[PDB]
Amino acid sequence: AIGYVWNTLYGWVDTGTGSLAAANLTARMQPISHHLAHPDTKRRFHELVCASGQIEHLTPIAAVAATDADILRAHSAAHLENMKRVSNLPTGGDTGDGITMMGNGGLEIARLSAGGAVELTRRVATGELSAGYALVNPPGHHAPHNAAMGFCIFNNTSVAAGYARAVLGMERVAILDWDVHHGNGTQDIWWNDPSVLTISLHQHLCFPPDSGYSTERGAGNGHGYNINVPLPPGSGNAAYLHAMDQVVLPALRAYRPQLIIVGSGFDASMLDPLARMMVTADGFRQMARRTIDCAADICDGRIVFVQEGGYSPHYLPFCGLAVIEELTGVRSLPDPYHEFLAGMGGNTLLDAERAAIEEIVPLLADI
Ligand SMILES: O=C(CCC1CCCC1)NO
Ligand SMILES: [K+]
Ligand SMILES: [K+]
Ligand SMILES: [Zn+2]
Secondary structure (H helix, E strand, O other): OEEEEOOHHHHHOOOOOOOOOOOEOOOOEOOOOOOOOOOHHHHHHHHHHHHOOHHHHOEEOOOOOOOHHHHHOOOOHHHHHHHHHHHHOOOEEEOOOOOOEEEOOOHHHHHHHHHHHHHHHHHHHOOOOOEEEEOOOOOOOOOOOOOOEOOEOOOHHHHHHHHHHHOOOOOOEEEEEOOOOOOHHHHHHOOOOOOEEEEEEEEOOOOOOOOOOOOOOOOHHHOOOEEEEEEOOOOEHHHHHHHHHHHHHHHHHHHOOOEEEEEEOOOOEOOOOOOOOEEOHHHHHHHHHHHHHHHHHHOOOOEEEEEOOOOOOOOHHHHHHHHHHHHHOOOOOOOOOHHHHHOOOOOOOOHHHHHHHHOOHHHHHHO
């Protein structure tokens, strides 16, 4: 049984009329119908999950709104208070960083996004489900303990991991983040805490700026329980699967989590506007396959995927479908872009890629 979360409101997130920041007449940033983060991209993924027939192999799980208690396991009372505040504004608005906006009442959606991750986590932990994918929106991994950031209101995977820790009594949880941007929020939240191993693969210094260096290793009892794998622009399937094999999977096996949560972004894809990486649907397929197999070996198959970023409405649905197919074991459709993308490269491990990953291998000794 493979759980699947999609709530209609995930597709109703109001991304304004700007491209990234708001439209601005003095800067001459013309308004546009689809912001970079427009919910249509993730909606097209959900619709492909249905139209492909994958939905018939999935167990639909209703999102439940994350409570104040749930949120406070990951975030400060002050941040919760502040998002209540901004969502209660007549029109809502931007939440701090000049991208991240919410509508009036957009808190409802941020709760359903975090609660989607929590609900799926709860039901995978009870053994009701073997695994699942929570196709949530808004995303989570940039939101640190005390803020919203980079389209993220609450850190969904951290709320889920906080729930697994405090409510389910798990001693150890791993969050593996392969969204192409650094999971700075997740890293912040669990920084001093060895009970949640936080791992991020990302294009080096893509977003946020000055974040995600491999020197950022946690502090105190948490020292050695945060691992960044910054990769160079242009890295493709070869670099990513090498990072999986040399760093990620050895880290998980060393750490022995009771649950693996994957912050599953597809912005590392070959066609994404918001990074310069070259991963194809087959790359994501292999990443998902390896991680699922790892969970089968070390924590009774307990794996929960939770949607992060990804900005190609064209190609993201096929990258996400590939992950879903690895969960169901039913392989319904080809990637129709495969022939087109396969000639572009990324499938050879370049020296600079190899070297970036090798810098990380020594950190495994501290788990
Ligand atoms: O996908 C995300 C958010 C993308 C950032 C890049 C533009 C500012 C927000 N992070 O992983
Ligand atoms: K990442
Ligand atoms: K940690
Ligand atoms: Zn991202």
